UniProtKB/Swiss-Prot annotation, chains A, B, C:
Glycyl lysine isopeptide (Lys-Gly) (interchain with G-Cter in SUMO2) crosslink residues: 63
UniProt note on tissues of expression: Highly expressed in fibroblasts, some expression in T- and B-lymphocytes, and little or no expression in Burkitt's lymphoma cell lines. Expressed in many hormone-independent mammary carcinoma cell lines.
TM helices/strands, residue ranges: none
Disease: Cataract 30, multiple types: An opacification of the crystalline lens of the eye that frequently results in visual impairment or blindness. Opacities vary in morphology, are often confined to a portion of the lens, and may be static or progressive. In general, the more posteriorly located and dense an opacity, the greater the impact on visual function.
Record organism: Homo sapiens
Annotated compartments: Cytoplasm; Cytoplasm, Cytoskeleton; Nucleus matrix; Cell membrane
Protein name: Vimentin
Family: Belongs to the intermediate filament family.
PTM characteristics: One of the most prominent phosphoproteins in various cells of mesenchymal origin. Phosphorylation is enhanced during cell division, at which time vimentin filaments are significantly reorganized. Phosphorylation by PKN1 inhibits the formation of filaments. Phosphorylated by STK33. Phosphorylated on tyrosine residues by SRMS.
Coiled-coil residue windows: 1-83
Modified-residue entries (Phosphoserine), positions: 54, 66
Subunit details: Homomer assembled from elementary dimers. Identified in complexes that contain VIM, EZR, AHNAK, BFSP1, BFSP2, ANK2, PLEC, PRX and spectrin. Interacts with BCAS3. Interacts with LGSN. Interacts with SYNM. Interacts (via rod region) with PLEC (via CH 1 domain). Interacts with PLEC isoform 1C. Interacts with STK33. Interacts with LARP6. Interacts with RAB8B. Interacts with TOR1A; the interaction associates TOR1A with the cytoskeleton. Interacts with TOR1AIP1. Interacts with DIAPH1. Interacts with EPPK1; interaction is dependent of higher-order structure of intermediate filament. (Microbial infection) Interacts with HCV core protein.
Positions of modified residues (N6-succinyllysine): 28
């Protein structure tokens, strides 16, 4: 009457193999997570870099204009007054 | 003769647990997808930022050269002509 | 006495479906991997871009100072000597 010895062995084999595939995908998944987590950090550092670059490039543009004004005045001074 | 009541219960337990692990990996996977999708967007914005920075840094380099030329002429004017 | 024909069919159905879910998650996982791998490359190119931008923005700041010095000397020359 009783009969479950060969069936539970089949379930065990199919379970083992399915577990192995789930295992590999999990390990790959964890690997991608750490990678994209460090990528997020590198992303932050990049964002902080471009803004500071935008600040210093602004200070340069303003000082360049200052040089342009002072030169234009040097040009409207010694060349066209009395002579 | 008939016998499948205890076997289908074993399959059900192993199925439930395998489904749970597949479930968690799926949720983590979806989480990584949204994260890397927003990272792709931040990547685009960064690319657009560095090119525009490269355009304005070019306009500055050209105008700096212009200042250098006009100064060099101011220096070759009032100091070394007649006096 | 013998009895495993209907049980192995149940295991087969549950196996097929679990395999299908594992299959999809695997394909999504592979897709995220290639995406984050190319993102890593774009990350490298960005890093190389910001440093070179930092080098040229430095050369500009130094030359701007040079222009400031030469102008300040042009201003302390023709306006306040003998006249």
């Amino acid at each position: 009457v009783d009969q479950l010895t060969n069936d539970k062995a089949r379930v065990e084999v199919e379970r083992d193999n399915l577990a192995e595939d789930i295992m590999r995908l999990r390990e790959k998944l964890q690997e991608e997570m750490l990678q994209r987590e460090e990528a997020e950090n590198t992303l932050q550092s990049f964002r902080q870099d471009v803004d500071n670059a935008s600040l210093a490039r602004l200070d340069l543009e303003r000082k360049v204009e200052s040089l342009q004004e002072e030169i234009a005045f040097l040009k409207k001074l010694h060349e066209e007054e009395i002579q």
